[PDB]
Structure formats: C-alpha cells, structure tokens
Amino acid sequence: FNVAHGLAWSYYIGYLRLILPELQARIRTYNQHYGAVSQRLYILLPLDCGVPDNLSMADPNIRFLDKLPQQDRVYSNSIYELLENGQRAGTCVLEYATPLQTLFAMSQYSQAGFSREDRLEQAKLFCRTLEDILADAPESQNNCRLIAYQEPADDSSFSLSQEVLRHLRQEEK
Amino acid sequence: FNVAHGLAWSYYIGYLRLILPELQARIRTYNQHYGAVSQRLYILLPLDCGVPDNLSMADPNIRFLDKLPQQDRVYSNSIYELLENGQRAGTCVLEYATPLQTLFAMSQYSQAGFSREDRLEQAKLFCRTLEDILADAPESQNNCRLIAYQEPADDSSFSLSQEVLRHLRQEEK
Ligand SMILES: CCc1nc(C)oc1C(=O)Nc1nc2cc(C(N)=O)cnc2n1C/C=C/Cn1c(NC(=O)c2oc(C)nc2CC)nc2cc(C(N)=O)cc(OCCCO)c21
C-alpha cells in the first residue's frame, strides 16, 4: 500500500549502506590520481518520478566528466561538472534515485495496483523515509545529499544545474 | 504495510525484466564454448528469509562450477552442479531472491516498522506476487523458475540440493 516505504528501505539496505562507506576513499583516490570532486554522493529525487532511460541528464549545464574508479560487485558512479553562465561552478558524483523510476513503471502496469495519480504522494514518502533512514544511519558519515525537487506546475523554466549548485554551495558554507 | 508487494515489483522491474531476455543467449554461449547447463534462472526463495551474506550455498551437494559470461551493467550469475549420492545429477544457474534478505534486515531495524514475527507472511506474499508477475510477463519466455521452500518446523534434515533437483527433473519431464 505505502509502497515507497519498502523501496526506501531496500534502496538503503541493498545499495546505499554498501556503496557509501567506500565512497570517500574512491573520491580521494580520483582527486589524487585523475578541479576537485566534492566528497558526497548527490542523489537526484525528481518528485515527478521522471528518470531518463539511459540515466543521462538532458541539462547541458550538467556535463559528464568521468566514472569514479572501483574500490563481484561493480559500481558505476558518474562525476559531472556543473556549468553556470559558461563557467565550471562545481564538480560532483551525481545520480538519480532509481526507485522513483520504479514507482513510475509500477503506475503504468495494470496488475501493480498503483494508481497513476499516486506518483507524487509516493515520491514524497520515498524522500521522507530515505531522509529519516539517513539521519540515523551509521554508513552516512557526511557522504550523501538528497536533492528533491518539483518543476513549476505551469511548465515554466527549470534549471536542474542551479538546483544542484545551490546544494553544493550550502556545503561550501 | 504489505512491503513484500513493492519489493517483488521492484525486483522484477529493476532486475528480472533486464537480465531474463538475455539469459538464454548467455547460457547457449556457455554451452557452446565453456554436461550442459539448463536453460532457466533458478531463483531460491527460502521462506525463513535466510540468505547467506556471501551468497554462497552451505549444502556441499550444490557445488559452484563457474560464472556465466556477460552479454555499464555487469551481472554476476553463478552456475552450480547438483550432486546426489556422489553423482553429478544436474547443472543450472542458481541464485537467491535477495529481497528476502532485505525483509530479514528490515525486521532487525527498529525504525523500519517491520515486526520480526512477520517475515514468513511477507516472504509468502513476495513469492505470490512474483509468481503472479512472472505469469503475465513478456520477458519470462520459459527462462526462470521459482523454488520456494520452508525447512521442517521440528529442525529435521533438509536437502536444498534435492529441492532443486526435483524442480530440474520436472523440467526434464
Ligand atoms: C537492490 C537494492 C535496491 N532496492 C531498491 C528499491 O532499489 C535498489 C537499487 O537501486 N539497487 C542498486 N542500485 C545500483 C546502482 C549501481 C550502479 N550505479 O552501478 C549498482 N548496483 C545497484 N543496485 C543493486 C542492485 C541493482 C539491480 N540488481 C538487483 N536488484 C535487486 O535485487 C532488487 O531488489 C529489489 C526489491 N529491487 C531490486 C532492483 C533495484 N539484483 C541484482 C543482481 C545482480 C547480479 N546477479 O550480479 C546485479 C544487479 O544489478 C547490476 C546492475 C546495477 O545497475 C542486481
């Protein structure tokens, strides 16, 4: 019923609690060897549940730089540069919360019992649950940040790059 | 609340519907190049939710042979030989339904709201939901089999190898 609760816990249990303890060392290794990449995993949480199929960002101000190197479990995490009026303004490890894509897909399948008009409610519950987990989680040692956003309801202009930079600059301050 | 419903759908959406369409070709490639391996993914569903941490089977009659070869998404799937009274009796691709491990872990976390005594009920619901999904799923073209089992309640002897062989021999017949 409250499907997003279980998905948040699973996402923590089966992914975040495994990848997050080794992230800082992977980033410090990249910053030593291969314009420093910021220390946290930035997790994009579009409340419209729109995650591109290729996991690629359409915003040309969010430009793919490189894969993080590894620490039988291969983790593909991407480093992006954030541009603002033509200028490199930040560099971070960025990815979508893929369980939101699962909410979207469930809403499309007749036998999932997941109404199309419940995506927003479930997305918000996913965000709330995940933020509550991360607040009491030992593997989160200042190494992920949740970026939840809804684009304007009138379909006015939205900048995902500006959304991310606001969060990065809060961590600067 | 009915947490296992969402986990079954996620397991289908984010794993089974991606890996199952390419499985037959990976197996046929193995059977050509590298005692033929059976055609289906055998998915172990222990209703006690006991999935080993290393994903390794304690039963010495289930003996690791090899990894399936690949078809930025690396899938590690293991081929096992099934022994019966010292004899190679079958060969298949075998793995645990890892969302059952997630049910177990949720039951241990105070803030998950998942009672310890609800594991069996949720495991059964996971199995029921997953079997219902797979019955109407286009990517399941006769290429996975669910093996759900509960060991005797009095802690008498249980053979996981015999459990798997029964299913393999039904596919022979
Ligand atoms: C499984 C934890 C989970 N819970 C929810 C609701 O969301 C997730 C989540 O997002 N996890 C996840 N995200 C990742 C990103 C990367 C990365 N960026 O590299 C790498 N790994 C990630 N992972 C762990 C697994 C993902 C899919 N996957 C599953 N999935 C489930 O078990 C599962 O259970 C439930 C309830 N839902 C799911 C699907 C998400 N089993 C797999 C077995 C093998 C294998 N045999 O090797 C390989 C697999 O994937 C390889 C390609 C990865 O892109 C497997």
Ordered alpha helix ranges (H), chain A? 3-11, 17-32, 99-108, 119-135, 160-172
What sign does the CA torsion over A138, A142, A144, A146 have? positive
What sign does the CA torsion over B71, B142, B3, B104 have? negative
Map out the domains of chain B as residue ranges: 1-37, 38-173
Cβ atoms of B30 and B82 within 8 Å: the answer is no
Residue B26's φ and ψ, nearest 5 degrees, are: -65, -40
Residue of A nearest to B107 (CA): A9
Encoding tokens for residue A144? 């992920």
Resolution given for this structure, in angstroms = 1.7
Q: Is B74 annotated as a binding residue?
A: yes
Q: Is B3 annotated as a binding residue?
A: no
- Could you identify the atom of ligand 1 that is nearest to the CA of residue A8? 6
Q: How far is CA B57 from CA B51, B54, B81, B96, in A?
A: 9, 9, 12, 9
Q: Is A42 annotated as a binding residue?
A: no
> Does A99 sit within 8 Å of B111, measured CB to CB?
no
Residues of A with CB under 8 A from a CB of B: 1-7, 9-10, 13-14, 67, 72-74, 76, 98-99, 101-102, 105-106, 109, 111-113, 132-133, 136
Cβ atoms of A9 and B99 within 8 Å: the answer is no
Spatial distance between the Cα atoms of B89 and B165, rounded to a whole number of angstroms: 8
Give the 3-state secondary structure of residue B34: coil
Residue of B nearest to A6 (CA): B3
Residue of B nearest to A122 (CA): B6
Encoding tokens for residue B87? 């004899």
B17 lines ligand 1 (CB under 6 A): no
Mutation target for A interface from B1, B11, B13: give the one with most A CBs within 10 A.
Answer: B13
DSSP class of B61: T
Segment holding A91, helix H or strand E:
strand A87-96
Of A82, A95, A76, nearest in space to A37 by CA: A82
> Does B76 sit within 8 Å of A76, measured CB to CB?
no
What sign does the CA torsion over B53, B59, B62, B63 have? positive
Q: How far is CA B171 from CA A77, A124, B61, B97, B145, in A?
A: 40, 45, 20, 20, 10
Give the 3-state secondary structure of residue B9: helix
DSSP class of A34: -
Q: Is A75 annotated as a binding residue?
A: yes
> Residue A102: which of B14, B76, B113 has the nearest Cβ?
B14
Residue of B nearest to A4 (CA): B6
Residues from chain A that touch B106, judged by Cβ atoms under 8 A, are: 6, 9, 13
DSSP class of B14: I
A98 lines ligand 1 (CB under 6 A): yes
Give the 3-state secondary structure of residue B157: coil
Residues from chain A that touch B1, judged by Cβ atoms under 8 A, are: 1-2, 5
Residues from chain B that touch A72, judged by Cβ atoms under 8 A, are: 67, 76
Give the 3-state secondary structure of residue A145: strand
Spatial distance between the Cα atoms of A105 and A100, rounded to a whole number of angstroms: 9
